[PDB]
Every structure is written in structure tokens, then in C-alpha cells.
Scaffold this active site. Structure first.
Site, PDB file in Angstrom:
ATOM      1  N   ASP A 127     -10.851  61.950 -95.744  1.00 32.08           N
ATOM      2  CA  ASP A 127     -10.096  61.262 -94.715  1.00 32.08           C
ATOM      3  C   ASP A 127      -9.908  62.125 -93.476  1.00 32.08           C
ATOM      4  OD1 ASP A 127      -8.343  59.714 -93.161  1.00 32.08           O
ATOM      5  OD2 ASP A 127      -6.703  59.777 -94.638  1.00 32.08           O
TER       6      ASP A 127
ATOM      7  N   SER B   7     -14.415  57.881 -75.762  1.00 35.00           N
ATOM      8  CA  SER B   7     -15.662  57.170 -75.577  1.00 35.00           C
ATOM      9  C   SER B   7     -15.854  56.765 -74.117  1.00 35.00           C
ATOM     10  CB  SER B   7     -15.696  55.931 -76.472  1.00 35.00           C
ATOM     11  OG  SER B   7     -16.854  55.164 -76.211  1.00 35.00           O
TER      12      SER B   7
HETATM   13  N1  F06 Z   1      -6.641  57.938 -91.555  1.00 31.12           N
HETATM   14  C1  F06 Z   1      -5.333  57.918 -91.890  1.00 31.12           C
HETATM   15  N2  F06 Z   1      -4.854  58.491 -92.939  1.00 31.12           N
HETATM   16  S1  F06 Z   1      -4.236  57.072 -90.841  1.00 31.12           S
HETATM   17  C2  F06 Z   1      -5.317  56.214 -89.641  1.00 31.12           C
HETATM   18  C3  F06 Z   1      -4.353  55.269 -88.926  1.00 31.12           C
HETATM   19  C4  F06 Z   1      -4.214  53.944 -89.390  1.00 31.12           C
HETATM   20  C5  F06 Z   1      -3.303  53.127 -88.712  1.00 31.12           C
HETATM   21  C6  F06 Z   1      -2.553  53.590 -87.631  1.00 31.12           C
HETATM   22  C7  F06 Z   1      -2.693  54.900 -87.167  1.00 31.12           C
HETATM   23  C8  F06 Z   1      -3.606  55.728 -87.840  1.00 31.12           C
HETATM   24 CL1  F06 Z   1      -3.766  57.351 -87.263  1.00 31.12          CL
END
Ligand code: F06
Length: 330
Positions: free
Chosen positions: A35, A199
Site C-alpha cells: 500500500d 499530472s
Molecule cells: N491508501 C490508503 N491507505 S488511503 C488512500 C485514500 C483513500 C481515501 C481518501 C484518502 C486517501 Cl489518502
């Protein structure tokens, strides 16, 4: 040193990818979700509430001669779908694709929410964002990459995710046989703790390129591509019958559709996401309404270059003194 591990979609839709990770002595192999949007390595374990475990493989620190409780340390984290986990911490030996780190913090789950329990294919997470996001209290811990960095041939890792197919995570080297053309590097901001970049624009299908700055994160732990509402409206407007559905929670389209591609800019370079990549299938079993792979970030607070986008490229997470991101076609 280097490591190289295969990453495999958990299901037919590439909802997520799992990578085998060796933890402890003797090794205990768990399938983790790498992740780049978080910075905690946590696992299902012998400490997890029994009713909250359903088919995952668990880490049992008492069976590992190299496990040490990290006294007083606890952790607690939540994700984008509102799931969460929490627990205590051990240090132990962790290897990924032949690359070994001693003294890695392995965060042991005492509690996980239903979405984790409900997914038997994911045994935990391995965070690869910056360590400043690590949740361990009262002593924040480093990610696997940060611990390995000093040992690596080059302070990089690469993500090469497959479309309905296995891919690869490499540590410490760039495989020049894994991409086509050249790699375009782009600046990264680490102030929010993410692999945050900008981007240069987009195109919809065979449409002309729109030059516009889109700030967002490279996030292997997000399935979909989340972009500003203007951009996403422009895409779905090219699909007959597509519509944003509040009941479903985003854009849906007729499953009979052929989707157009989506191009995103990296500096002066262009990455093309084939339309089939944007199809996430029936909204419910047997439905002829399908879920879109490009969705609005309005409401999230940040744009997210999730797996839908990253799997169209070979991506270099450069953890040099000044970190950068590299993208190539493949
Ligand atoms: N990749 C993660 N553990 S959190 C990614 C994410 C999903 C929804 C809102 C903000 C984020 Cl940073």
C-alpha cells in the site's frame, strides 16, 4: 541488496493485489496488500479477535524465535473505505522477494473491522508511503522500505501491476526489460506523507490532450482512479448511458458498452489506460449496470492515481534524498 516479488490480483476484477511476505523464524508466509498510500505493516495474528478472523493466514509471534514484543507500543489505522484495524507491535525478521530486514515493526491486529474479516485473501497490509504516516504510538516506526533503503543497491522500489494478471514489486533496482521506451520522472511532495505528484493533463479516448495540473497521489492501495469532477464528467460523457448514481455511489454504465481509453500526463509523456481497464463489472451479481473505474475525487479531498492508473505503467518510487516518481509505458 535487492528483492523481487510477484503480486497477484485477489479476484477477477483486480480489486487489490497480494504479495507473499515472510515473517519470523522459521518463516511464516502471509499475503499482504502492498500500500503506497499508508505506512503501517500490520497482520492478522494469533492475537486477533477469533470472531474477526475468517480464513486469513495469521502470524503467531510466539512461534517465532526472532519476534520481540515492542513494549508499550500500540497502533490504530483507518482506510478509504472506512475500514480500520488496531493492535500491539512486535519486532521481527521480514523478507520480501529475497530481501530481508531485521527488527521490522510487525503490527499485530487485535481488532479488524468487518471488511477485513470478510476478505479472506488479504492477511494484512505492508505500507510504502513515508514513515511520517506510521501510526505506532508512542514511538513511530519505519516502513519496510525505509528500513531496507540503506542496504539496497539503489534506494528505489518499483510497482508493475498486471491487468487481470500477476505483476511484480522490485526493491533496489529497475528492471529495464519490464517497460518500453524511457522512464519519465516527476517531482514529489512528501509534506502530506504520500507519493504526491502533479499530472500534466489528460485525454479521453482519441480526443485532444487537455493541459491542466492535477495534483494527486500514487496509491497502489486504492483500486480505482479518483479525479476532479470536471475530468470524470468529461470521460463518462463519452459513454452512452453512463450516469452518476448516488444509490450506487459513483458512475455506472451499461455493461454492453465499449469504454474509451483514458490518457494521463507525466511531464511531457503520456500514459494510456485502455478502456477495458476502466470496467469493474456488474454493480451486483447478474446486473447489466457496471461500475466505472474512473470516479470523482470530490468529497475525498485528494486525487488518487489508484491501481486503475498505475497498472497501465511501470512505476518507480524513488526514495532518494529528494524523492521522485517515474512512469513508463509497458
Ligand atoms: N491508501 C490508503 N491507505 S488511503 C488512500 C485514500 C483513500 C481515501 C481518501 C484518502 C486517501 Cl489518502
Amino acid at each position: 541488496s535487492t528483492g523481487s516479488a510477484t503480486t497477484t490480483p485477489i479476484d477477477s476484477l483486480d480489486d487489490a493485489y497480494i504479495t507473499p511476505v515472510q515473517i519470523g523464524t522459521p518463516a511464516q508466509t502471509l499475503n499482504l496488500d502492498f500500500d503506497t498510500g499508508s505506512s503501517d505493516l500490520w497482520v492478522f495474528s494469533s492475537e486477533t479477535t477469533a470472531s474477526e478472523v475468517d480464513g486469513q493466514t495469521i502470524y503467531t509471534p510466539s512461534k517465532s524465535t526472532t519476534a520481540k514484543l515492542l513494549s508499550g507500543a500500540t497502533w490504530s489505522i483507518s482506510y478509504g473505505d472506512g475500514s480500520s484495524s488496531s493492535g500491539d507491535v512486535y519486532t521481527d525478521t521480514v523478507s520480501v522477494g529475497g530481501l530481508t530486514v531485521t527488527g521490522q515493526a510487525v503490527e499485530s491486529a487485535k481488532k479488524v473491522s468487518s471488511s477485513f474479516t470478510e476478505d479472506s485473501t488479504i492477511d494484512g497490509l505492508l505500507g510504502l508511503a513515508f514513515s511520517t504516516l506510521n501510526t505506532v504510538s508512542p514511538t513511530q516506526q519505519k516502513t519496510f522500505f525505509d528500513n531496507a533503503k540503506a542496504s539496497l543497491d539503489s534506494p528505489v522500489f518499483t510497482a508493475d501491476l498486471g491487468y487481470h494478471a500477476p505483476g511484480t514489486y522490485n526493491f533496489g533496482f529497475i528492471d529495464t526489460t519490464a517497460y518500453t521506451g524511457s522512464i519519465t520522472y516527476t517531482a514529489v511532495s512528501t509534506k502530506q506523507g504520500f507519493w504526491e505528484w502533479t499530472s500534466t493533463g489528460y485525454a479521453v479516448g482519441s480526443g485532444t490532450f487537455k493541459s491542466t495540473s492535477i495534483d494527486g497521489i500514487a496509491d497502489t492501495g486504492t483500486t480505482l482512479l479518483y479525479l476532479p469532477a470536471t475530468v470524470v464528467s468529461a470521460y463518462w460523457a463519452q459513454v452512452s448511458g453512463a450516469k452518476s448514481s448516488s444509490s450506487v455511489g459513483g458512475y455506472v454504465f451499461p455493461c454492453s458498452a465499449t469504454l474509451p481509453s483514458f490518457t494521463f500526463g507525466v511531464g511531457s509523456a503520456r500514459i494510456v489506460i485502455p478502456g477495458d481497464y476502466i470496467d469493474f463489472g456488474p454493480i451486483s451479481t447478474g446486473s447489466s449496470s457496471c461500475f466505472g473505474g474512473i470516479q470523482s475525487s470530490a468529497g475525498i479531498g485528494i486525487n488518487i492515481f489508484g491501481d486503475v492508473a498505475l497498472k497501465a505503467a511501470f512505476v518507480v518510487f524513488n526514495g532518494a534524498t529528494t524523492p521522485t516518481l517515474g512512469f513508463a509505458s509497458k
